[PDB]
Amino acid sequence: MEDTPLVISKQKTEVVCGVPTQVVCTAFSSHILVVVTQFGKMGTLVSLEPSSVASDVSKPVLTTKVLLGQDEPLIHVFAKNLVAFVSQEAGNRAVLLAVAVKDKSMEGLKALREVIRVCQVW
Amino acid sequence: MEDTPLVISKQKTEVVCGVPTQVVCTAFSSHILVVVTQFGKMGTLVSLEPSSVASDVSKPVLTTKVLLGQDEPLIHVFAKNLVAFVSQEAGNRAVLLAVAVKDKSMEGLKALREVIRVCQVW
């Protein structure tokens, strides 16, 4: 059992755009799981995965797929802008995002990235 | 607002059939998220929810969908056996299971269920 890897998680609750929001980040070997929940809802699940290999002069293209919940164009844009930096800083691991945020704005998204940053596990 | 949880989560690490296993259970308004991880992997993502044709078996038969990972028959039977009781007890909430178990066994399955019990959030 020597060298079993630890599954690492960190959470914070913060008021974001006036609304109480809990963020949890959990690091697996292939994925970072990012959970952003308002009003106790699990929300929509979005898979974000690199679809090209990184180089010295390029970041991987990220493809998004809604796995559960409301599949709307805005959620793909929102997920990508929310957690692209997580994938890129975590060795180009994929991200599994559970996001329950009713009122999406660039304001809330930038505030949420800061909370994610506080909950870094990569 | 304090830095305190909005949703309840319980976790436990246990050696199961010789393999250190991390279990985390989190309760959402309409879902229970259960993570069962060995060897640092996120594993297969499986949604489980009470069938709509499923009437008066006091436990509905469950509909299972692999959302991420290998979609093959055995992981569906494993998921049902592992967490049917979660859904039944949780107010028939849906279950989203992330499961990475290297060697499935009757012994292992039963022991895993006891760890999930220790993480009861419903």
Rg of chain A to the nearest angstrom? 14 Å
Gross morphology of chain A? globular
Whole-Å distance between the termini of chain A?
23 Å
Assembly classification:
homodimer
| CATH uppermost class of chain A | Alpha Beta
Q: Widest sheet of chain A: strand order?
A: 1-2-3-6-4-5
Set out the fold topology.
The structure is a homodimer of 122-residue chains.
Chain A: E1 8-16, E2 19-27, E3 31-38, E4 44-50, E5 62-68, H1 73-89, E6 94-100, H2 106-118
PDB class: chaperone
Keywords: beta sandwich, homodimer, proteasome, chaperone
Assembly: dimeric
The gist of it:
The structure is a homodimer of 122-residue chains. Chain A is α+β, with helices and mostly antiparallel strands and 122 residues long.
What do you see in this structure?
Two copies of one chain form a homodimer. The first copy, chain A, contains two helices and six strands. The first copy, chain A, has one domain (1-122): Ribosomal Protein S5, domain 2 (2-Layer Sandwich), CATH 3.30.230.90. In chain A, a hairpin with a 3-residue loop joins strand 2 and strand 3. A six-stranded mixed beta sheet of chain A has the order 1-2-3-6-4-5. Chain A has 122 residues and is α+β, with helices and mostly antiparallel strands. Chain A has helices at residues 73-89, 106-118; strands at 8-16, 19-27, 31-38, 44-50, 62-68, 94-100. It is classed as chaperone. The entry lists the keywords homodimer, proteasome, chaperone. It forms a dimeric assembly. The entry is titled "Crystal Structure of Proteasome Assembling Chaperone 3". Chains A, B are Proteasome Assembling Chaperone 3. Organism of A, B: Homo sapiens.
